[PDB]
Structures are given as C-alpha cells and as structure tokens.
C-alpha cells in the first residue's frame, strides 16, 4: 500500500479495448490495485471472464455505476488505499517505462497533476478565454509555448483531490453533468487553487499510444462537433463560478535523463 498507486479506469462501450489494456496495466510496477468504473448501465460486467483468466498480479475491483457520468471516476472510492491515483482513459496505453518514471516524479510533487497530455487556455478578448493546444499562439511571455492544464485521463494525482473535488461548489458538479465534459478542466482549477502552483507538470511520454480506432463501438468523445467549442465554454463558466481565472502557465517539460540513451546531449 506504501509507494504504490491505484489505477482508476472508467470504461464506456469499449469493453474489448478495456480487456486489452487491463492485460497491460496489471503488470506495471508499483501498481497496488485497479478500479474499473463501469459506466455501461444494465450491462453485465466482465469480472467473471476476468477471473476465469486469473490469477492476476493485483486485485481488480469492478464497480457498476448508477448512470453513465464523466464524474463517476471522481468519487471517493473506499478501496483506494494509496496516496496516488493513476487515471487513464480506456483507450490509452502508456508504456510501463513511462508510468514508473512519471510516478517517481509524482512523488516529488504529490500536490500536482503529473501527466502526459498538456493543454492550455488563451485569451484575446479581455476576460474571455478559449481552450486549445499548441496550435494557438503562446499566451506566455517570451519563447516557446506554455500549458496551464494536464488532462487527468493520463495522469498521476494525489487521491485526496477526489475528496476535495466532492467538496467543490454545486455549480461545478452541475456544470460537469450538464456537459459530460470538462471534468478534467475542473480538477485542474481545483488543484491550482489549492496549491497556488501550476496544476500540473508535463512529462513527455516516450511510448504512449491511443487505441481509439481499434475498437468496436463509439468513435470517441473528442470527435463530436461541439467538443472543443464546449471546452472553451467550460473554462469561461468556471471563471464565473469561482469568480476568477486560477490556472497558471508553465513551460516545464520533463524527460527521463538518459532514456533513451544519451538524450541529454
């Protein structure tokens, strides 16, 4: 339970993709337990099939959910006995090498969101914010780019945030349910307000693959027409609810010294 993390993977109409990723994550070092947040209402969980294929390196708890909400994976699960939580979308495969190193980074910055997918917010109209990535001009000062968020769907964060999240303003919970989007944007707001530091630190993945297309079922949430537009919306809504833009920019990109070999020179 000490020096270990808990994998929280929410899955929706991607059971085939899920079983494949589960075979991967179960074998990662420092993994204490896995919590599958089953969002397939009225659909028989896979646990049975999962046991017939045992033994497994660690315990895997399949929690059926009331409704299919993006927030479900943010509840305070009693079976989480680790200080750190590893949250991954059920369509992403992060190499063990990336997890071990990133987790070791999280331990040096437990109060921050350590992940592999960085994003930013920009502003052009005094007070009006927009959501985006490196395709948008750097809001930042001089050189390079900046990021003010790390998406929780590929990250390590202190499990006490799930608690802190629950204690957040009702309007925020409402906002997440109303859109079934921007739950990670909320978490980033929540974290930075709590620490006063950038909500996250970006760890460049040496081997992370997205399996979106390799699945029977839905194409994926970010392909919806109003996805991005919906995200810019959320940032502005949160600024209203919290009455202020808390996100702070950062341009720190951490890579593993010497992995690959001689990448320092």
Ligand X SMILES: O=c1ccn([C@@H]2O[C@H](COP(=O)(O)OP(=O)(O)O)[C@@H](O)[C@H]2O)c(=O)[nH]1
Ligand Y SMILES: O=C(O)[C@H]1O[C@@H](O[C@@H]2[C@@H](O)[C@H](O)O[C@H](CO)[C@@H]2O)[C@H](O)[C@@H](O)[C@@H]1O
Residues in the site for its own copies, rule: CB under 8 A? 97, 100-101, 104-105, 108, 118, 134, 138, 142-147, 202, 204, 250-265
User: How crowded is residue 41: how many other Cβ atoms within 10 Å of its Cβ?
Assistant: 11
Q: Which of 171, 221, 245, 254 binds ligand X (CB under 6 A)?
A: 221
- By CB under 6 A, residue 184 contacts ligand X: no
Q: Let me know: does 112 contact 191? Beta carbons within 8 Å.
A: yes
Q: Let me know: does 187 contact 147? Beta carbons within 8 Å.
A: no
Distance, CA of 185 to CA of 237 (rounded, Å): 11
Between 113 and 132, how does the x/- string for binding to ligand Y read (CB under 6 A)? ------x-------------
Task: Provide, rounded to whole angstroms, the least separation between the CB of residue 223 and ligand X.
Answer: 7
User: How crowded is residue 115: how many other Cβ atoms within 10 Å of its Cβ?
Assistant: 29
For ligand X, the closer CB: 109 or 221: 221
Residue nearest to ligand Y (CB): 222
**Residue 71 labelled as part of a binding site:** no
Between 115 and 154, how does the x/- string for binding to ligand X read (CB under 6 A)? --------------------------------------x-
Q: Which of 32, 33, 71, 231 binds ligand Y (CB under 6 A)?
A: 231
**Residue 111 labelled as part of a binding site:** no
Active site residues: 184
- By CB under 6 A, residue 14 contacts ligand Y: no
User: How crowded is residue 131: how many other Cβ atoms within 10 Å of its Cβ?
Assistant: 22
User: Which three-class secondary structure string do you get for 141-163?
Assistant: CCCCCCECEECCCEEEEECHHHH
- By CB under 5 A, residue 91 contacts Mn ion: yes
- By CB under 5 A, residue 183 contacts Mn ion: no
How distant is the alpha carbon of residue 88 from its chain centre?
6
Q: Let me know: does 91 contact 49? Beta carbons within 8 Å.
A: no
Q: Which of 7, 33, 77, 90 binds ligand X (CB under 6 A)?
A: 90
Q: Is 93 helix (H, G, I), strand (E, B) or coil?
A: strand
Binding residues for Mn ion, how many (CB under 5 A)?
Answer: 3
Q: Let me know: does 236 contact 244? Beta carbons within 8 Å.
A: no
- By CB under 6 A, residue 222 contacts ligand Y: yes
45 DSSP assignment: -
Distance, CA of 211 to CA of 213 (rounded, Å): 6
Question: In Å, what is the CA distance from 96 to each residue of 5, 31, 110, 185, 188?
Answer: 13, 10, 20, 26, 25
Binding residues for ligand X, how many (CB under 6 A)?
Answer: 15
Pairing of strands 92-94, 208-210: antiparallel
* Residue in the block written with tokens 């997440």: 176
Binding residues for UDP-N-acetyl-alpha-D-galactosamine: 10, 14, 39, 68, 73, 89-91, 183, 231
Binding residues: 10, 14, 39, 68, 73, 89-91, 183-184, 231
Give residues in contact with ligand X (CB under 6 A): 10-12, 14, 39, 68, 70, 89-91, 153, 180, 220-222
Give residues in contact with Mn ion (CB under 5 A): 89, 91, 220
Give residues in contact with ligand Y (CB under 6 A): 119, 133, 135, 151, 153, 222, 231
């Amino acid at each position: 339970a000490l020096d270990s993390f808990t994998l929280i993977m929410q899955t929706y109409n991607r059971t085939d993709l899920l079983l494949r990723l589960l075979n991967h994550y179960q074998a990662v070092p420092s993994l204490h337990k896995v919590i599958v947040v089953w969002n397939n209402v009225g659909e028989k969980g896979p646990e049975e099939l999962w046991n017939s294929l045992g033994p497994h390196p660690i315990p895997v708890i399949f929690k059926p959910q009331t409704a299919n909400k993006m927030r479900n994976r943010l509840q305070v699960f009693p079976e989480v006995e680790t200080n750190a939580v590893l949250m991954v979308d059920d369509d992403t495969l992060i190499s063990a090498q990336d997890l071990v190193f990133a987790f070791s980074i999280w331990q040096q910055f437990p109060d921050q969101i350590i992940g592999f997918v960085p994003r930013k917010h920009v502003s052009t109209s005094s007070g009006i914010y927009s959501y985006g990535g490196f395709e948008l001009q750097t809001p930042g000062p001089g050189n390079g780019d900046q990021y003010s968020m790390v998406l929780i769907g590929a990250s390590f964060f202190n499990s006490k945030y799930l608690e802190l999240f629950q204690k957040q303003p009702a309007a925020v919970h409402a906002l997440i349910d109303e859109t079934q989007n921007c739950d990670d944007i909320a978490m980033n707001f929540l974290v930075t307000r709590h620490t006063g530091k950038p909500s996250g630190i970006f760890v460049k993945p040496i081997n992370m693959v997205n399996l979106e297309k390799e699945t029977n079922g839905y194409s994926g949430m970010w392909h919806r027409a109003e996805h991005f537009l919906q995200r810019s919306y959320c940032i502005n809504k949160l600024v209203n609810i919290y009455d202020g833009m808390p996100l702070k920019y950062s341009n720190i990109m951490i890579s593993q010294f010497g992995f690959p070999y001689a990448n320092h020179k």
